[PDB]
Each structure stands twice: as C-alpha cells, then as structure tokens.
C-alpha cells in the first residue's frame, strides 16, 4: 500500500520523505515485514515501470540505489555472528544484487555468519575463497535464467560443502543439473543449512 | 593509526567483518569523515585494486573488501545532511561501473549542504538529462575512473545535461572535459565551492 | 533485542557502567530508526525514564549525569557527521541559567540535517554577548531551547527581541505566551524550525 | 601557528575549517601531543582574550564547546576497558569540564576504566554511584577554589577507597581538609592509583 508513496517520493527526489516513509513501514511491519510489504513490491514496480517505458534508467537507478542502501543497513543491523562463514553472491553475469542481500539478511537474522560478497563472482575465485575461509556453504541468487544456462553441468557442485541456489531465474531442474540444492523460501534457508 | 590500513585489509581478507567495522570506526574517530576516506578507505581500496591486478588475490576476495568499503561510504552519505532545493545528480558515464568516486563526490557535496542525489553508476545520457530537466537539477557531476568510456562519447555530449556539468576522476582530464563540454575539476573540495 | 526493548537495554547498560554495550545498543537504534528517529524513539525516552527514576528516588544525579553525558556524546557525533555548510549561521543556545543542553543540540542537528549552518554555542549564553556574536557573524537567526520555565521567568519583557533578525524559542519550559512576552517566535516541533527558515 | 589559525576559524564561525586544522594537529602530534600543543594553548588564549575583553562569553562558549567535542572524541578513541571504574567529575558548583575530561583521558590511555560523568556532581549522589558501580576511585578536577571552600571538612573522604583532587583551584592543604589525595600531574595518576 505504502509502495506508491515511497516510489513517488523517490521519483521527485525527496530522499528525506522516502526514508521517513520507509522508517514508518519498518516501525509498523518490522524488519522482515517491511521487506515483503514495501521493499520488494517497490522494487518490482520500478522494474515494471522501466519495462513499460514509464520511467527511464536514471529514475530506476535512483530507486534501486535507495533500496540497496536500506537493505544494506538492515544487513548490518542483523550483525555478523561468529563461526565458519557462508558466502553469498550471484552467478557470473548476474548483476541483480537484492535477492542475494535478502538471503544474507535472513541467514544473519538466524545467527548464520553470511558474508555478502556483492554480485557476479567467478566460480573458481568463489571456490578458492570458500576453501581458504573454511566456509560451510555458498548461497547464490539468480534473477535471470541465462547465466545459469551458460554454466556446465555440475558447475556449482563443490564450491563449498553445501551450495544453495534460489531466485526467480532458478528452478529445481536447473539446480539439479548444476549440482546445487534448490530453495525457494529464505526464512527456511538457515534450517536447511543446519540439517544434513 | 599508521597500522589501521594494514589491519583493516587483513581483517577483510580473513572475513572478520566485525573487526573490520571496529577498525573503520577507529579511523573515522581519528581522522574525521572526510579524513577517513582519504587516509583509510581510498588507500585500502587502491591496495585491493593493485593486489587483484598483480594476480595476488581473486575476484571473490576483492569483492568482499570492495562491498564492505562501499557499505561504509553509503552509511556516511546517509548520515550527511540532505537539504531541500534543486538537486545535483551524481553518477558515472555510460559504460563506467566504478562507482566509488561518484559516491565520494556526492558525500563531499552533501557535507557542504548541497543536495547531491547519488544515482548509482552508468547512466545513459538521454535519461540523465530527462531526470535533470524534470527535477530542475542545478548541476550534474560525473566520475570517470577509465578514460575509454569518455573517448567513446561524441564531442559536446555532456554539454547541456544541466545548467552546470562537472567531470572528474583519474579517467578524466581538462582536454577531454573541454571536448565533451563539461567543466573539469580535480579536487573534491573545490566542487562545492564551484556552487 | 526487539526495538521495543532497546530503551530498557540501553538504560540498564548505562546504570551498570557498560559504555561499550550502551554504544552498541545505540548504534542498533540508529540503524533501525535512522538519525532523527533514534533521537525521538531512543534518546528522548531514555532521558525521560532517567528523569522519572530520579524523581521517584530510584537513581541520583550521578546516574543521571552519566546517562546525559553519554547521550550528549552520541548526539554530538551525529552532529559532526551531518557536515557544517557555508552561509550566514544560525546560533543555537539556551537562555541564561539554563544548563540543559540536549534540546539545543537537537535543534542544531535537525537544522544541519536540512543544510542550515546551525552553530551550537553550548548552553547558558548571556543575551548581550549572544546579540554581539549574531551581528558580527551576520547570523540570520538565533534559536533558544528552554527545558525549565524559571530561567525564562528571570528575563525582563522583550529581552529576546532582535538578538538577530529572527529569534525562535522552544522546549518544554517555553510556551507561546512566554515567547510573546520575551519577543521571540514560538515553535513547538523541531521539524517546523527548518521550514520557518 | 595552527593554534592562531584554529582560534581565528572558530571566532569567524568556520567550524569546518576549525575541524580541519584540529585534525591536522591530531595527525601531526598524535593524541597526547595535540592536547599539549594545540588544545590547551587555544583554551588558554581564549581565556586571556576574554579577560582582556577582546572576545565575549558567546565566543568563549563556542570555542569551549568545540574543544569539549574534540576531547570527547579522543576519550572514545582511547576506549573503555573492563573492570571496576574510576569516576571522574568536578565538585558541586564547578562547571569547568576540560580538566576532568583530560584526567579521564590520561587514565583511559593507561587502560584504566575512567567514567567521565560530566561536571558538577552533588557529593551524596556521587558516593551513591561509586558504591553502586563498585568504583575503586573517584577523581575530581577543580579550576576554581570557591566550590572547594564551600564543602565541609572531610567531605571527599570515603567517596571511594581512593579519592584524588587536582586542578588550579586545588592544593595540598585543601585536599587534606577535604580528605582527598592531592595530585598535580595527570601522567602520574594511573601510577598513583596502582600504588
Ligand atoms: C526489478 C526488475 C528489473 C530491474 C530492477 C531490479 C534491480 N534494481 O536489481 C532492472 C532494470 C535492474 C532489471 C534488470 C534486468 N532484468 Co528485469 N525485471 C525486474 C522484475 C520486475 C523483478 C526482479 C527482481 O529483482 N525481483 C526481486 C528478486 C529478489 O526476487 P526473486 O528472484 O523472485 O526471489 C524471490 C525468492 O526466490 C527469494 N530468493 C531470491 N534469491 C534467492 C536465493 C535463495 C538461495 C533463496 C532460498 C531464495 C531466494 O527472495 C525473493 C523474494 O521472495 C522482474 C519481473 C517480475 N515481476 O518478477 C524482471 C525480469 C527478471 N527482468 C528481466 C530482464 C530480461 C532483465 C534485463 C536483462 C533487461 C535489460 N535489457 O536490461 C535487465 C538486466 C540484466 C543484468 N544482469 O543486468 C526478465 C528475465 C527473464 C528470464 N527468462 O530470465 C524478467 C523475469 C521479466 C519478466 N517477467 O519477463 N530488471
Ligand atoms: C582502485 C581500483 C579498483 C577499486 C575501485 C573503486 C572504484 N573506483 O569504484 C575496486 C577494488 C572496487 C576495483 C574494482 C574493479 N576495477 Co579496478 N583497479 C583499481 C585501480 C587500482 C585504479 C584506481 C581507482 O579505481 N581509484 C579510485 C578512484 C576513486 O580514484 P580516482 O578515480 O583517482 O579519483 C580520485 C579523485 O579524482 C577524486 N574524484 C573522483 N571522481 C571525481 C569526480 C569529480 C567531479 C572530482 C572533482 C573529483 C573526483 O576522488 C578520488 C579520490 O581522490 C586500477 C589500476 C591502477 N590504475 O593502478 C584498477 C582498474 C581500474 N580496475 C580494473 C577493473 C577491470 C576492475 C574490476 C572489473 C576488477 C575485478 N573484477 O575485481 C572491478 C570492477 C568493480 C566495479 N565494476 O565497480 C582495471 C580496468 C581495465 C580497463 N582498462 O578496463 C584496472 C585498470 C586494473 C588493471 N590493471 O587491470 N578497482
Ligand atoms: C538531563 C537532566 C538534567 C541535567 C542536564 C544535563 C545537560 N547538560 O544536558 C542537569 C544535571 C544539568 C539537570 C539539572 C537540573 N534539572 Co534536570 N533533568 C534532566 C532530564 C533528565 C533532561 C531532559 C533533556 O535533556 N532532554 C529532553 C528535552 C529536550 O525534551 P523537551 O524539553 O521535551 O523538548 C522537546 C521539544 O520541546 C523540542 N525542543 C527542545 N528545544 C527546542 C527548541 C526549539 C526552537 C524547538 C522548535 C523545539 C525544541 O525537542 C524536544 C523533543 O521533542 C530531565 C527529565 C525530562 N523529562 O526531560 C530533567 C528535568 C528537566 N530536570 C529537572 C530539574 C528540577 C532540574 C534542576 C532544577 C534540579 C536540580 N537542582 O537537580 C536542575 C537545574 C539545572 C539548570 N538550571 O538547568 C526536572 C524539572 C522539573 C519540572 N518538570 O519542571 C526534570 C523534568 C526531571 C524530573 N523532575 O522528572 N537536569
Ligand atoms: C573555559 C572557561 C570557562 C567555561 C567552562 C566551560 C567547560 N564546559 O569546560 C565557562 C564559560 C563555563 C566559564 C565560566 C566561568 N569561569 Co571560566 N574561564 C574558562 C577558561 C578560559 C578555561 C581555562 C583553563 O584553565 N583550562 C585548563 C584547565 C584544565 O585548567 P588548567 O589551568 O589547564 O589546569 C591544568 C591542571 O590543573 C590539570 N588538571 C585539571 N584537573 C585535574 C585533576 C587532577 C587530579 C590532576 C592531577 C590534574 C588536573 O589539567 C589542566 C591542563 O594541564 C579559564 C581561563 C584560564 N586562565 O584557564 C576561565 C576561568 C577559569 N574562569 C573563571 C571564572 C571566574 C569563571 C566564572 C566564575 C565566570 C563568571 N562570571 O561566571 C564562571 C564560573 C562557572 C562555574 N560555576 O564553575 C576564571 C577563574 C577564577 C579563579 N582564579 O578562581 C578564569 C581563570 C577566567 C580568567 N581568564 O580570569 N569559564
């Protein structure tokens, strides 16, 4: 409901009003709630508005940068607990960061030390870092399907002892082909990781 | 203080984000906001860049460090004043994905009471002018790390994005700014003075 | 710790002398509510509980001093992150005899956040000295925060008139009538202050 | 003449310039050094200028508030170690804070958990806080002598097992009368406390 107001504030360059509206939502729904009720709907509307030609790239950039900033702040508010890290990123060629940041946030909320790398990490580099840090897991967020299609069979299999793949670009069959565990629900990710 | 840069980078490369945050706050408290960016954030960023280019670290390690430093700068940006009145749009040229210079410029402006709107990097020029016109922006500021994206632009391309257009970063120089129709500025402090 | 509990947590941290813990809780609040929000939803409620606990006799002045000093330091830190812009300043202080500084610092902070060069002088400034500084710096306004009403009672009618081209008075110690008596504009909401400029 | 420059910046309301000069001093002399070479000489010049009538109370206030803020930041950079605290304040009626903050800083630099309360604490309330926190010591800074003269004999005696009094307002006889240990040198404070 609040999404229209927030987007209108952003598109008129009223940063203070956007942040105030976002804080109101955060106070009302709480951290998880504001992400499902406000952040994600606005992100989606920005996407759709762009594709319809109602807004241009500058406006989309402004809105996306604002939402990233808000999500980064929630990520840091969940804080960084001890223990072997989980590396969170996106496949090579994937620049959509929000899904990855959400996954890191839901993990940290459950006491999992999710290290958000940013998007678009080469698989050998990722595997090397996981090995060196003794990471328990790698979590990948895929918005587009093409970057997954470009990977060879089994490519995600041994990035770390456990590898999870989600996002709208992914499905069970493609996860199976790549050797990743497929997950749709962020709230359950920590439990899936703690389980064998 | 002499050791904060080494300490911060080592903390990052071992995935000690809590340690890295504490060291960065120490730098912030010692040097102040502008100072920590000059004396800590930028030297560490540069070292990360050079280590990558020498092949000493991979992209995952660089990403870890870079993402953390971006987050810190964004946080300072949001703590600055955002005053009302005609904004200044801050971004990078099309094809330029290095964003930290643009964020720094937005930060220095906000610290001086200029309503700098950071768009993120890599904004098409027709879209930038549309938003500048629609918001009645007084200026556009572009940060260029690489020179190639500027060379790809036609003469006069930046000329009337807004009433004033500023170009800086290591990718830019006075001649290229003149060719593109932008004002060249080398020092971030001088940017705010120019307005 | 739920946001609803950060106030209790922060006060408990202070009352046991755990400054490191208090700072962590305050940063959590800052990240959750944002800069203005943490002041309204954490700093001010804690200060009020401290005040009420003192009046009930549960804590003394030393505990209040510890909490006030800590919260002042946090607000000062936010003030210095806002950046100080150029242009004719707004001088921010409290009336003579008024040693409560938080209201004044809050006013300076809200102004700086909106790009107004609010110069915080500290509290308790003699009126002739204040007027002299305003004219020398060409200050566009003076802002006074009054927590208690007694320091305003001590001032003669019209005392705040033309300290500067605009003079604003607020805080729990002030009301529109005392403001009218003293020759100041009354403002109740810190947000309205920036708009008035 | 960083000190001259800093004071001139403050008296003209150039807070950004004053902060930059202070950071320069901090970077050159370091934490202890900037206090000796910059903070204290400026405070004394402010004092002298006021007494000569060259500046008013508003200017003094502005400079004092700025220096307090800088010293609070150094206090927080020193950190707060664990263990039973030392409470640092000033006598009732004493509103001068810098001396007390300096004492807290020298203690924290030596790993002593010096809790700065702010100035002007009633003695019963101070004793109650020391008791409740199990404080090992109380440290008082006195600039003026009158606030000490107003106190009854033995008033400071058992605020904690160790009670130290210093500052220009204090001396050995008055410390003896009040039941405090008199100390002149900040550097020596933590050593006095350990022995
Ligand atoms: C927003 C959006 C954009 C915007 C804004 C997003 C941004 N700023 O990051 C921008 C303009 C950025 C964008 C870019 C593009 N996108 Co677009 N746009 C969308 C839109 C509307 C939403 C996508 C999104 O980011 N959602 C948020 C993400 C986080 O949600 P999600 O993946 O559904 O994940 C959910 C769950 O799976 C879970 N989750 C996410 N990750 C993970 C991981 C794990 C492990 C788990 C358990 C859960 C989980 O959390 C999420 C919320 O519950 C969709 C259409 C739609 N309505 O869905 C397209 C869509 C993704 N876009 C599309 C396209 C084509 C593009 C572009 C290539 C277009 C172009 N020519 O530039 C570009 C850029 C390519 C690139 N790499 O740069 C297509 C892709 C089609 C395909 N077959 O792959 C889509 C699907 C449109 C459509 N319905 O046809 N897009
Ligand atoms: C530091 C650095 C980084 C930092 C960059 C931070 C950033 N710029 O966003 C990090 C580690 C993030 C990085 C990442 C990458 N970069 Co890099 N790295 C470098 C390095 C060492 C260049 C220095 C630099 O970026 N300076 C930082 C900026 C902020 O400083 P500056 O531009 O001098 O600007 C200063 C002033 O001009 C002023 N300023 C800036 N903008 C403006 C604007 C105005 C108006 C004004 C007044 C002032 C002003 O403020 C700044 C501080 O003083 C070079 C190698 C070299 N030159 O020695 C590469 C280099 C630029 N990187 C390169 C690449 C390819 C990358 C990566 C793709 C590598 C990777 N996969 O890990 C990524 C891309 C990430 C991204 N898309 O953002 C290549 C580019 C090759 C090419 N010709 O295309 C280089 C040349 C390295 C190499 N030899 O291969 N990089
Ligand atoms: C901290 C404190 C002290 C500290 C102050 C430290 C410091 N340097 O800041 C010290 C030790 C000095 C102190 C001493 C005294 N104080 Co006292 N203490 C407090 C306390 C806990 C502080 C309140 C505060 O700092 N901020 C809260 C203020 C800013 O909020 P506010 O006034 O509601 O104002 C709001 C708006 O009006 C607006 N605003 C503020 N200024 C301005 C300006 C403008 C222009 C605008 C638009 C808006 C605006 O912003 C605020 C947020 O919405 C309060 C308890 C309380 N409930 O406040 C008492 C309280 C004010 N103190 C009280 C008393 C009695 C005293 C003493 C007289 C008693 C004594 N001898 O100990 C002395 C007198 C000292 C003096 N002459 O100033 C009482 C007052 C009794 C009463 N209600 O009338 C209170 C209420 C405590 C209680 N009884 O519960 N105190
Ligand atoms: C700043 C200042 C104020 C500020 C204080 C603000 C603040 N929050 O800090 C304000 C505006 C409040 C102020 C007001 C007043 N003050 Co005044 N002002 C000064 C000033 C300029 C400070 C200078 C100073 O001494 N700083 C340094 C501190 C640290 O003291 P110091 O001399 O350096 O002592 C050193 C050591 O003693 C050591 N130290 C300190 N504490 C301790 C503790 C221990 C254990 C140890 C080992 C060492 C130690 O550290 C210091 C640095 O090395 C002085 C001018 C001056 N000559 O210094 C006056 C001065 C002290 N003020 C003075 C007076 C009288 C007043 C007022 C009475 C004026 C009035 N008309 O109201 C009021 C009284 C307020 C009160 N009730 O206490 C007189 C002192 C009179 C006297 N000889 O007794 C002075 C000297 C003015 C002058 N130039 O004549 N003042």
Numbering used by the authors:
A (entry chain B): 82 to 277
B (entry chain A): 80 to 274
C (entry chain C): 78 to 274
D (entry chain D): 82 to 276
Give sentences from the paper.
CarH proteins are a unique class of coenzyme B12 or adenosylcobalamin (AdoCbl) binding photoreceptors involved in the regulation of the carotenoid biosynthetic genes in several bacteria. AdoCbl-bound CarH forms a tetramer in the dark, consisting of a dimer of dimers through interactions between cobalamin-binding domains (CBD)12,13. The tetramer can suppress transcription by binding to a specific promoter region via the N-terminal DNA-binding domains (DBD). Upon illumination, the protein in solution dissociates into light-adapted monomers, concomitant with the release of the DNA and transcription initiation.
The role of His132 in light-driven structural rearrangement was studied by producing a TtCBD-H132A variant. Anaerobic photoconversion of the Ado-Co(III)-His177 ligated TtCBD-H132A shows a spectrum which is consistent with the formation of a Co(I) cobalamin species. Here, the His177-Co bond has been broken (~3.8 Å distance for chain A) with an outward displacement of the corrin ring, similar to that observed in wild-type Ianaer structure. Anomalous density confirmed the location of the Co atom in chain A. This structure is likely to represent the Co(I) cobalamin state, which is more stable in the TtCBD-H132A variant. Compared to the wild type, the superposition of the Ianaer-H132A structure with the corresponding DO2-H132A showed much less global structural perturbation in the overall protein backbone (average displacement Cɑ atoms – 0.4 Å). Illumination under anaerobic conditions leads to conversion of the lower axial His177-Co(III)-Ado ligated species to pentacoordinate Co(II)-His132 upper axial ligation (observed in WT Ianaer), presumably via a tetracoordinate Co(I) species (as seen in Ianaer-H132A).
